[PDB]
């Protein structure tokens, strides 16, 4: 059933001898050569350099909070950089942050000690994780940190960074405490005067170059992904592709996910219109998102496959016809020396004859074939 067109005709006709005529055997199809995913250019980008490349950092008890929205958040440069000692993602894998959107992303930056870096994670315990910054067990996001000894450490001690030692209750997730009030740890009351049982709850890190790795300053930024009912504001940059035209390619333009061959178009869109449509509610032209231009799409070429053969008793030679297919795209029959073209389609295995004789086998579109000396 798959050796030669005459054999493909015999299988469909369920007969060893095939009468003279034109018989449909299969369906021609042009498969997608490749896949392209084109999305609008990054243009305005999330300014993660405002937090990561910030000149000064806040204390852990006074951790800064920045809202990131209405921008594309590129993360390839983040986890590729080797300057970061800690890069841990909880509840999500590094690949999909460039594919998943969230309504809000929070950048929470502060400075802690080297041995306190492990304390920023769900289900963590310690002085920082209980009195300075608490993370929920269902936290969605990543915690990133990098060594900052060359900046936040000063000879003789840099005391600009402070941390809380005591608190009556554990800090709730995503909570801040700037109380800086005289904490009480005894039955004796107090009136804001330092004494035997009256203590200042704030102590400052001693950051010195000679300190150990566990005693070195470490700048920490926590990125908090979160999805609410309101539609997402930050979408990761979908991987851009090279535009390919005149070749049948699977395409994905902002979720169109259509199949066909794209060519440069002529119709004019209004600037607010993103993709065209035909009468039958089938996508017909698409505005290219990277650069503002119009691309007319047409379906991948397909058509019936017919076998034009005389009686099998008369001959075994056959000629195939691919209806509604241009002759160039056909090769995607072994007698490829002669390839005639007609309005009906691409006729392989026969030769056009300038002379005209009465028709017995109708090819289609006015042309007809026949066995001849």
């Amino acid at each position, epitope marked *: 059933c798959a050796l030669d067109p005459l054999s493909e005709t015999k299988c469909t006709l369920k007969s060893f001898t095939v009468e003279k005529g034109i018989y449909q055997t299969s369906n021609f199809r042009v498969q997608p050569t490749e896949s392209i995913v084109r999305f609008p250019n990054i243009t305005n980008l999330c300014p993660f350099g405002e937090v990561f490349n910030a000149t000064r950092f806040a204390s852990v008890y006074a951790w800064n909070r920045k809202r990131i929205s209405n921008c594309v958040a590129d993360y390839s440069v983040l*986890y*590729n950089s080797a300057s970061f000692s800690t*890069f*841990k*993602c*909880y*509840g*999500v*894998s*590094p*690949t999909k942050l460039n594919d998943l959107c969230f309504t809000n992303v929070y950048a929470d930056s502060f400075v802690i000690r080297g*041995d306190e870096v*492990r*304390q920023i*994670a*769900p*289900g963590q*315990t*310690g002085k920082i994780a209980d009195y300075n910054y608490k993370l*929920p*067990d*269902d*936290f969605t996001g990543c915690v990133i940190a990098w060594n900052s000894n060359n900046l936040d450490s000063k000879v003789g001690g840099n005391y600009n960074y402070l941390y809380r030692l005591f608190r009556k209750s554990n800090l709730k997730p995503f909570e801040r405490d700037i109380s800086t009030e005289i904490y009480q740890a005894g039955s004796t009351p107090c009136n804001g005067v330092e004494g035997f049982n009256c203590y200042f709850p704030l102590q400052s890190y001693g950051f010195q170059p000679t300190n150990g790795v*566990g005693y070195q300053p470490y700048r920490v930024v926590v990125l908090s992904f979160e999805l609410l009912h309101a539609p997402a504001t930050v979408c990761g940059p979908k991987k851009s592709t090279n535009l390919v035209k005149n070749k049948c390619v699977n395409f994905n333009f902002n979720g169109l996910t259509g199949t066909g061959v794209l060519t440069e178009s002529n119709k004019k869109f209004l600037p607010f219109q993103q993709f065209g449509r035909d009468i039958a509610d089938t996508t017909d032209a698409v505005r290219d998102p990277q650069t503002l231009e119009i691309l007319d799409i047409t379906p991948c070429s397909f058509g019936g496959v017919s076998v034009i053969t005389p009686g099998t008793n008369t001959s075994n030679q056959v000629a195939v016809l691919y209806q509604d297919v241009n002759c160039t795209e056909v090769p995607v029959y072994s007698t490829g020396s002669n390839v005639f073209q007609t309005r009906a389609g691409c006729l392989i295995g026969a030769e056009h004859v300038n002379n005209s004789y009465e028709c017995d086998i109708p090819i289609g579109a006015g042309i007809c074939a026949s066995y001849q000396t």
Partner: antibody
Amino acid sequence: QSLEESGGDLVKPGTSLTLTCTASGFSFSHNYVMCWVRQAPGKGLECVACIYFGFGDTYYASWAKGRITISKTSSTTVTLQMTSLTAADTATYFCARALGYYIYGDAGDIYIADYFKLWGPGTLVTVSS
Amino acid sequence: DIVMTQTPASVEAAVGGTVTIKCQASQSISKYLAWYQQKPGQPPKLLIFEASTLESGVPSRFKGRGSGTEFTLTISDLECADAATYYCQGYYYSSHSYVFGGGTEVVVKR
């Protein structure tokens, strides 16, 4: 912060017993991985089976072929079930808490639940006629 | 598919001495190692994680080194309370599995 075990007692061979751990001070979020560590009287420890709340799937040890079942019944309960109890099941069973996190690597992205931090007192399970 | 071989079965030293614990990974475990101290009738307590980082609250004498298939734990200035059973657990991310070692017993010579 606290993990407590229950359900261990003397059970005849061939029947089934259930073991339960309760989450107090925290909830069974997707960021946590729960496993069972069993040690025999005067012997070493071994991992029975594990459940990942992130994916909802469960991994089992090689020595068990459908004999062990894990099901997180609620946000503060995860149950264990051992069938076809034999003398090899006479041991003390513990349950602890782990964390699952993702790191970008050359080959791809891998899930890490490396070490175990906080545990529970454990319940002794004895199998005899 | 992983076996943590722990040698020797026991280690001894006087007060203030040094005892080493040798743990071998049959297949490469990389950096997912932990050490645990366990007393009879009490749950294992984490000493070292990452095989090079001190758990919060543990004394500095509990030191761990090694990577790949050779994992080490040395105790300095042995105390009377250090007499317990120590284990090494390597997490193989390839099979998402935990395997424990045979165990090491600490004896305080006197």
